[PDB]
């Protein structure tokens, strides 16, 4: 009698539960869930490149050169690619489920290796020529009966590519449309300082020498860039394994502690803020503030309707202690640029008292 939905049918019949929607944001979901699957290996420190290519017919190539997908047969009986992509936990699986076709060629183990699903199913694994070059291809085409639209949008993957390529010094990601070739290429090898110079360019930095840290710890490590420009407003970005947490959490709340403490305590050294004189607000210190915070959790739990909210109260913590000892060692390594950003605050904090007497 009753029919209940489990696994990939599920995901067929409301794809938007688990993509977002059946429009433009969902179809690029997909290409969200599987180049992030191999950044995930330049993360860990595998893969150097990573190439999304457009292809004409309208499926999308995903080339990386990490570890490839494993192959060897899963606990289940059933090769572990199969596993990943035919069984939920979100995940790449989900593309599988919401494209007529996947196909997915590995090369791990000393060959090649090739398997093609047709409408989600299986078609056998097939094992090809020797090699001792590791990495993995995805190729899939989205199903027109699942969206609204079936056309990528050049400019809105570049975007998201280019920040990952940010967040990621070692790698290289390559982006080529091969319809209507036209290809862009992202390395920054100053990494979340490039990030930091590029979101200050139409804003005018106020001081030149631009904040770059690290801190490892246990299930976690952080890497903060941050450089004041004559903005009234703060575009501070987080990520956390290279997603980008809009929402924000504990490890941008971690950042913020540390920053009003260190500002407020060096100011009172320096007797640049008034003993008397209360101290300076989380909004005034940040008052044109550009900065870059991206943390890699082991294992990160994200709240918020939106799921873009780091929750790991362990890395509160974490980034509080880092950015505590080490804009410390900023602030005192470069008193001129202190001297500036402080003077900000202070400015920062008159122009609200400013508003409120007159009038
Ligand atoms: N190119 C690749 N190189 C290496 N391993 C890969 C890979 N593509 C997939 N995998 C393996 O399969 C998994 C991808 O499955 P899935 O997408 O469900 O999980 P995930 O670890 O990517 C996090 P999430 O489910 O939130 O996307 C990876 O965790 C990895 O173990
Ligand atoms: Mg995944």
């Not at 027109?144 to 990528?152: I, L, R």
Request: charged share 25%; aromatic share 6%.
């Amino acid at each position: 009698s009753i029919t209940i939905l489990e696994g990939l049918e599920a995901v067929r019949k409301r794809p938007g539960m688990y993509i977002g929607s059946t429009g433009e944001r969902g179809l690029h979901h997909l290409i969200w869930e599987v180049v992030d699957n191999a950044v995930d290996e330049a993360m860990a420190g595998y893969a150097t490149t990573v190439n999304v290519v457009l292809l004409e017919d309208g499926g999308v190539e995903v080339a990386d050169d990490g570890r490839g997908i494993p192959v060897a047969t899963h606990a289940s009986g059933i090769p572990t690619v199969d596993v990943v992509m035919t069984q939920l936990h979100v995940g790449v699986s989900v593309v599988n489920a919401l494209s007529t076709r996947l196909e997915v060629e590995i090369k791990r183990d000393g060959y090649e290796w090739s398997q093609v699903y047709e409408k989600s199913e299986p078609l056998g694994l097939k094992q090809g020529a020797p090699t001792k070059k590791t990495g993995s291809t995805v190729r899939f085409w989205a199903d027109p009966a699942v969206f609204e639209t079936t056309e990528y949008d050049f400019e809105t993957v570049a975007r998201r590519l280019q920040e990952m390529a940010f967040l990621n010094k070692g790698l290289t990601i390559n982006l080529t449309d091969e319809r209507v070739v036209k290809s862009r290429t992202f390395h920054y090898p100053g990494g979340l300082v490039d990030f930091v110079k590029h979101i200050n360019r139409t804003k005018n930095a106020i001081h030149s020498s631009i904040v770059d840290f690290s801190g490892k710890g246990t299930g976690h490590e952080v890497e903060i860039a941050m450089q004041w420009n004559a903005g009234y407003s703060e575009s501070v970005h987080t990520f956390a394994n290279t997603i980008n947490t809009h929402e924000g959490g504990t490890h941008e709340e971690g950042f913020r502690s540390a920053l009003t403490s260190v500002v407020n305590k060096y100011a009172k050294d320096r007797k640049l803020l008034k003993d008397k004189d209360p101290n300076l607000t989380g909004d005034d210190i940040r008052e044109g503030l550009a900065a870059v915070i991206s943390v890699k959790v082991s294992e990160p739990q994200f709240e918020g309707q939106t799921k873009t909210k780091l929750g790991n109260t362990e890395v509160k913590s974490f980034v509080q202690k880092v950015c505590n000892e080490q804009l410390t060692h900023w602030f005192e390594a470069n008193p001129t640029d202190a001297k500036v950003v402080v003077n900000k605050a202070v400015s920062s904090a008159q122009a609200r008292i400013a508003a409120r007497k007159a009038r």
